[PDB]
């Protein structure tokens, strides 16, 4: 193999096989030193190590591996494919990064809030290798990037227009107002016309390099799509407002420039692992010995006083929340340092260990106190060996219990010392599957009719339905028949015995011939099921991601937070879901913005997955252009300074002085709103800001709009609060939006509107202010409710006062009925229906809201209200009096409310499966505490799984009746508890 030394010297080496030939660094070093006195001189001045580069596709690649030459099989395969026997490898000096690179890295660190280059809490190079490996998708997305559409990021959907919106088009025409300087002209256009056609019509109705931008917002109506397919156009149609656009010059694509990538490409880590024949290094499948681990001891500087006098260690081998084997140590007195030095031998073979298996070490007292996880197979298909001293996590099913990260608090957490068996040669797990040539003896005989019926019934069941041993055996024995039905994939793969190598090989053969799945229609619930905690195998995840790859940008935006949370379920840092999220955030600007904020919140608040999300955020930030970087920097600056001011105020006219200090110093002239990238906030209306009379003391801030083209002088309401976790609020609001879309596809407009919520840091966040909205508790306290006495006419009189005319009042009543029904159904399904008046808001137009979901979500998870009087949802006598005449018999408005809520309940029951998987993900990810069964099953009990539509309708009517039974009792109890 030809080598180029750094003096363009060409030294001809030879192919030295693949057995421990990574000493080629030393071999070439010695060859250069002997063949050149200059190399001998530079040996005293050169860096510690050098690099290997070659030409894959014109771009420089790097051999980033110091273990074996079998990893370098990719460059050899490329060289043979190109038919170039003498291969060229260049050595490059390990140049330190330049000052500009260091400054860019510091800027990225400031944006992320976590130091990705720190290696003080890692025992391997998985995160660094993930950083090196995320370059190729980033460069692929940057290369295949259309500059104009990326700069302008049109927001379009391909769904048909809703019936209530399709009817709203008066005469199959849409009025658009185009503003040019001070001139305003209204043009009538058909809903099936592209914006280019509208622009051409406007120009003919008197240069051509112009576009339509929404007045007062950073949204462009461009691209080749009908005007009715724009999300802002649909938003304006739904609200009945006029569509105002301005003729603006297109934004410069040069502002989205991305600086050149500084690292060479890293290839893949699958080179080290080959087929079973190639690896029989030592093949993992050759070792038939049982797995064994030594628990050396337990160390803790300060003993907790929670529980003592007895302690032991439990070692579990699990693959996707299924414990393959379980071993325990002899209990010992609970003191500062406990010593065992005992080998725990499991009944599972070493060859049968599946990739993604987790060694779960837990400390029990006498109940579970500390836990820590260790991935048995590392990212490079190698079994873990040697000493490991892991700092454990302290508990205060959960996604936090699956993390392979170590506790960063080295000086205060409990530490466990373990030992794993060592070997002379590294043990490498062979490749997943060479080829499905034998077909694994696919079944030929047709299933008996009764067995076919049993299999169909098993497939038709809900995701939460447990599978018996007979059910699993039937699913596996007829796997090739179950492939024809994509709905059976989660159940088919739940019946796989992952603790046997041969069964895993059969499963890999089975999924190597997936065609019915490939052409199958994209089902969101099924794919999210395949990404849950119950699937730790990489190939099932890849299948789910490749199905997700056919989504559109709006569809991804609907489920972006859920996928970000599901990244936690990935056993390894460099997963297909991470690549998919990075690619879709680099493709679209809105997706990138929301992904940045969602990921930064998790970095700030979740220590278990800080490093992985930090690496993903680094990849995205390097991918995006400099305009996005500047906007992110401005947003982070304003967020940090508002956080500091919130801290100072919470420590205690002072707010006015501090806001004046901010406005004249370091406050950016304009910043993008984190929960609405299309809106830019400018100066701060200090004379309107205040501090609300709440226990958390949030900041009521109002910013002026930074766009001069805005049609209104209305400010931008922003609430900054500290001491509450807004992540649960974001999850609840996202699920509300998903249910709103589900109702939309069934011609149901429940008037349920979620507000803007973004968590910006540790227990801080930003809340959108809904204008002209007040709280039901305040409405009561205006007349009666300060002392606890309650009246029914207060809400009706308040709505009557805010309505100038009778038609406005009737519209307000209709909106109140629809919003109340929608929120009742949504909160009953989600289990957050038992709230107090202080967390329910209402506008002057009648719309109803539920706020502060984090306050009630944790309380309901901890208590479930089984020890109190729980109501399914807030159907308060004031609501009934607003709806009907409160005659306790019926009313046309009450009948309409009952009908629409039953319709919404049946609509949600139509997508029970997706709702169930969303609820499960929400519980296991968004809950700081530990959940289990009987809590996940709440949704399948509330969604009335396995019952008729009439039975479900009767059940929901019974829930309404029991709400009507307890009129003021629950509200009075809440008042007494709070007071």
């Amino acid at each position: 193999i030809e080598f180029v030394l750094p003096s363009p010297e060409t030294a001809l080496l030879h192919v030295a096989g693949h057995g421990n030939v990574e000493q080629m660094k030393a071999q070439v070093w010695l060859r250069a030193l002997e063949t050149s006195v200059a190399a001998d001189f530079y040996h005293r001045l050169g860096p510690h190590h050098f690099l290997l580069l070659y030409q894959k596709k014109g771009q420089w690649y790097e051999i980033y591996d110091k273990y074996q030459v079998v990893q370098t099989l990719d460059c050899l395969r490329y060289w043979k494919a190109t038919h170039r026997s003498p291969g060229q490898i260049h050595l490059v000096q390990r140049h330190p990064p330049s000052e500009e690179s260091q400054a860019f890295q510091r800027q990225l660190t400031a944006l992320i809030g976590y130091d990705v280059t720190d290696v003080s809490n890692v025992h391997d190079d998985e995160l660094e290798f993930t950083r090196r490996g995320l370059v190729t998708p980033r460069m692929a997305e940057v290369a295949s990037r259309d500059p104009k559409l990326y700069a302008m990021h049109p927001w379009v959907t391909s769904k048909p227009l809703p019936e209530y919106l399709w009817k709203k088009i008066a005469n199959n025409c849409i009025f658009i107002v185009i503003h040019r300087s001070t001139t305003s002209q209204t043009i009538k256009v058909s809903p099936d016309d592209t914006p280019g056609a509208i622009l051409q019509s406007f120009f003919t109705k008197m240069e051509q390099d112009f576009v339509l931008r929404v007045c007062g917002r950073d949204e462009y109506l461009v691209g080749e799509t009908p005007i009715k397919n724009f999300q802002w156009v649909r938003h304006c149609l739904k609200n009945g407002e006029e569509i105002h656009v301005v003729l603006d010059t297109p934004p410069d694509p040069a502002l989205d420039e991305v600086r050149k990538e500084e690292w060479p490409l890293v290839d893949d880590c699958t080179g080290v692992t080959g087929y079973h024949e190639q690896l029989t290094t030592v093949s993992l499948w050759d070792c038939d010995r049982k797995f064994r681990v030594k628990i050396r001891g337990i160390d803790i500087p300060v003993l907790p006083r929670n529980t003592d006098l007895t302690v032991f260690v439990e070692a579990n081998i699990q693959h996707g929340q299924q414990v393959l084997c379980q071993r325990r140590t002899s209990p010992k007195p609970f003191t500062e340092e406990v010593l065992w030095n005992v080998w725990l031998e499991f009944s599972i073979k070493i060859k049968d260990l599946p990739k993604g298996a987790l060694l779960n070490l837990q400390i029990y007292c006498g109940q579970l106190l500390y836990y820590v996880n260790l991935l048995l197979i590392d990212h490079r298909f190698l079994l873990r060996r040697g000493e490991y001293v892991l700092h454990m996590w302290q508990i205060s099913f959960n996604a936090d219990k699956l993390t392979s990260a170590t506790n960063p608090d080295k000086e205060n957490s409990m530490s466990i010392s373990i030992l794993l068996d060592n070997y002379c040669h590294p043990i490498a797990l062979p490749k997943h599957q060479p080829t499905p040539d034998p077909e694994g003896d696919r079944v030929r005989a047709e299933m008996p009719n009764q067995l076919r019926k049993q299999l169909e019934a098993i497939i038709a069941t809900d995701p939460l339905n447990p599978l018996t041993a007979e059910d699993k055996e039937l699913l596996w024995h007829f796997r090739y028949e179950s492939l024809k039905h994509p709905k059976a994939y989660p159940k088919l793969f739940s019946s796989v015995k992952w603790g046997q190598q041969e069964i895993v090989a059969k499963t890999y053969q089975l999924l190597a011939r997936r065609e019915v799945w490939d052409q199958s229609a994209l089902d969101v619930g099924l794919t999210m099921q395949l990404l849950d905690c119950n699937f730790s195998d990489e190939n099932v995840r890849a299948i789910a991601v490749q199905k997700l790859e056919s989504l559109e940008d709006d569809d991804v935006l609907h489920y972006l937070l859920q996928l970000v949370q599901a990244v936690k379920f990935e056993p390894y840092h460099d997963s297909a879901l991470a690549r998919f999220l990075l690619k879709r955030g680099l493709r679209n600007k809105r997706i990138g913005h929301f992904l940045f904020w969602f990921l930064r919140s998790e970095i700030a608040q979740s220590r278990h997955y800080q490093q992985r999300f930090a690496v993903i955020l680094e990849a995205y930030l390097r991918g995006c252009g400099t305009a996005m970087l500047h906007d992110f920097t401005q947003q982070v600056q304003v967020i940090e300074m508002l956080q500091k001011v919130t801290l100072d105020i919470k420590s205690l006219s002072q707010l006015k002085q501090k806001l004046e200090n901010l406005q004249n110093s370091q406050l950016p002239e304009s910043f993008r709103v984190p929960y609405d990238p299309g809106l830019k906030a400018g100066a701060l209306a200090i004379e309107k800001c205040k501090v609300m009379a709440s226990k958390k003391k949030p900041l009521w801030l109002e910013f002026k709009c930074a766009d001069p083209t805005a049609l209104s002088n209305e400010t931008i309401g922003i609430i900054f609060k500290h001491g509450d976790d807004l992540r649960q609020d974001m999850l609840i609001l996202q699920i509300l939006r998903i249910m709103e879309s589900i109702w939309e596809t069934e011609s149901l407009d429940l008037c349920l509107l979620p507000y803007g919520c973004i968590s910006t840091g540790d227990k801080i966040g930003m809340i959108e202010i809904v204008k002209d909205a007040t709280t039901i508790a305040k409405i009561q306290q205006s007349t009666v409710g300060n002392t606890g006495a309650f009246k029914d006419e207060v809400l009706n009189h308040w709505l009557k006062e805010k309505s100038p005319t009778e038609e406005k009042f009737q519209a307000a009543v209709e909106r109140f009925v629809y919003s109340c029904a929608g929120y009742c159904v949504a909160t009953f399904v989600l289990g957050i229906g038992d709230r107090h008046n202080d967390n329910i808001m209402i506008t002057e137009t009648g719309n109803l809201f539920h706020i502060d979901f984090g306050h009630i979500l944790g309380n309901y998870k901890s208590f479930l209200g089984i020890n109190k009087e729980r109501v399914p949802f807030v159907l308060t006598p004031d609501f009934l009096f607003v709806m009907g005449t409160s005659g306790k018999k019926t009313s046309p408005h009450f009948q309409k409310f009952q009908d629409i809520c039953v319709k919404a309940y049946l609509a949600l029951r139509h997508h029970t499966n997706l709702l169930i998987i969303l609820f499960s993900m929400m519980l296991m990810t968004g809950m700081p505490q530990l959940t289990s069964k009987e809590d996940i099953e709440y949704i399948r009990d509330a969604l009335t799984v396995g019952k008729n539509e009439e039975d479900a309708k009767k059940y929901f009517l019974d829930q309404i009746e029991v709400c009507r039974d307890k009129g003021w009792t629950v509200q009075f109890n809440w008042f007494l508890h709070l007071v």
Epitope: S158, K487, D518, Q519, A521, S550, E552, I742, L906, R909
Partner: nanobody, 125 residues
Framework: QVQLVESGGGLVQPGGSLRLSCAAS????????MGWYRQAPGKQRELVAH???????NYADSVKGRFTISRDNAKNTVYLQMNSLKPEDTAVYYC????????????????????WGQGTQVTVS
């Protein structure tokens, strides 16, 4: 293998009506949403009518108010009822397993199925 056979098409005058039927050979028909696709001459195939396993119906904008889709899980057959036919409705109509109604990717373009049947020809003239 899932097999679908479409029937009911033919020549009809403008303003007329037609009723298509299609029988599916998939025995899990009960839990699968189905939809009707049409391929205009020199045009890509597009979903026009969507029905869920429960029975909720969603239609494309062009065919809204004139097309009605129904299913019978007992006979594993899906019916599409056309009213007030217009010349642009002339296309080859197909039925298959549709997708998610609220997903925009389903309404986007060809759903990349590999089990398309023969279809039926509808001509309005």
């Amino acid at each position: 293998q899932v097999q679908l056979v479409e029937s009911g098409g033919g020549l009809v005058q403008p303003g007329g009506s037609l009723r298509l039927s299609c029988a599916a050979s998939g025995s899990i028909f009960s839990i699968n949403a189905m939809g009707w696709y049409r391929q205009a001459p020199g045009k890509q195939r597009e979903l026009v009518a969507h029905i869920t396993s429960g029975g909720s119906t969603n239609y494309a904008d062009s065919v809204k108010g004139r097309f009605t889709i129904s299913r019978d899980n007992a006979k594993n057959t899906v019916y599409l009822q056309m009213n007030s036919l217009k010349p642009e409705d002339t296309a080859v109509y197909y039925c298959n397993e549709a997708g998610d109604p609220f997903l925009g990717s389903t309404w986007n373009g060809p759903p990349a199925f590999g089990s398309w049947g023969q279809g039926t020809q509808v001509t309005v003239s």
